[PDB]
Amino acid sequence: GSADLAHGGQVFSANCAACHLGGRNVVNPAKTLQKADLDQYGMASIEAITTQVTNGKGAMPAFGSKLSADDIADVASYVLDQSEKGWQG
Amino acid sequence: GSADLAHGGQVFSANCAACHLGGRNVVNPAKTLQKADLDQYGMASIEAITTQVTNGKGAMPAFGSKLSADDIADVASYVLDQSEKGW
Ligand code: HEC
Ligand code: HEC
């Protein structure tokens, strides 16, 4: 596909899969990356995901000082794309 | 003392149990709060626990901007005390 989504998947594996492998949320099981959960909590957008990745929230760490702006844009795109695809395989 | 440990337990329930319930570690089972693990990684002290809680590490979030210094001292004392008596 696109370069952005591919790089987003690498940012995801290295920074997010520890808690969200395959769209899970092993820490807070009510707040997964499945589309229904993103929709329930108003997180089904690039800007909302970007805000939470940048600032952290609750038990989720912040990445705003550790990732580049492009890294965060790409990982947000990857999450939204995988969520729309049902985190298939 | 007893006051510190009691408040530490409340800070722990509100901020740490999501990942460390009963002294475990839902994200990385190799790095629990059990005495053997704290000893292995040099984390079996108020100073070490305070630092990690304040700064975060890896997938563990930082709490230094969200908790008072007293909150962090107390939760550190709680964790050390639980580890010594076995969670
Ligand atoms: C474990 C330490 C995590 C890391 C690593 C990542 N996330 Fe996370 N995420 C975690 C928690 C505990 C929560 C809920 C926070 C709360 O209190 O509300 C979240 C939530 C999200 C969400 C929203 C999910 C939803 O509302 O259903 C998103 C979109 C999200 N997380 C993305 C994300 C990214 C992109 C990560 C790597 C940069 C990442 N998380 C890491 C726990 C953890
Ligand atoms: C999930 C989002 C966590 C939250 C909430 C808390 N901790 Fe944590 N802890 C977590 C991880 C992923 C790790 C290992 C980090 C690494 O990469 O090395 C830890 C580690 C600790 C340790 C050291 C344990 C050991 O070395 O065996 C301690 C003492 C510790 N965590 C304490 C602690 C406190 C007091 C918390 C609430 C304020 C807390 N953690 C929350 C994951 C998560």
Residue numbers in the entry:
A (entry chain A): -1 to 87
B (entry chain D): -1 to 85
Publication passage describing the model:
Upon extracting and aligning these dimers, their positions were nearly identical, with a RMSD of 0.259 Å between the two distinct dimers in the Cyt c6-7942 tetramer. The results indicated that the red-Cyt c6-7942 forms a stable dimer. The dimerization is energetically favorable, with an interaction free energy of −54.6 kcal/mol. However, the dissociation energy of 0.7 kcal/mol implies that the dimer is weakly stable and may dissociate in specific conditions. Specifically, the key residues involved included Ala16, Val24, Val25, Gly56, Ala57, Met58, Pro59 and Lys64 for Cyt c6-7942. Structural comparisons between red-Cyt c6-7942 and oxi-Cyt c6-7942 revealed some differences in surface amino acids, particularly charged residues, despite the largely similar positions of heme-binding pocket residues. In red-Cyt c6-7942, Asp69 formed additional hydrogen bonds with His5, stabilizing the connection between two α-helices. Additionally, the hydrogen bond between Asn23 and Asn26, along with the interaction between Thr30 and Gln32, result in a more compact structure. In the reduced form, non-heme-binding sites contribute to a more compact structure, which helps stabilize the dimeric configuration. Small structural differences between red-Cyt c6-7942 and oxi-Cyt c6-7942 suggest insights into the functional mechanism of photosynthetic electron transfer.
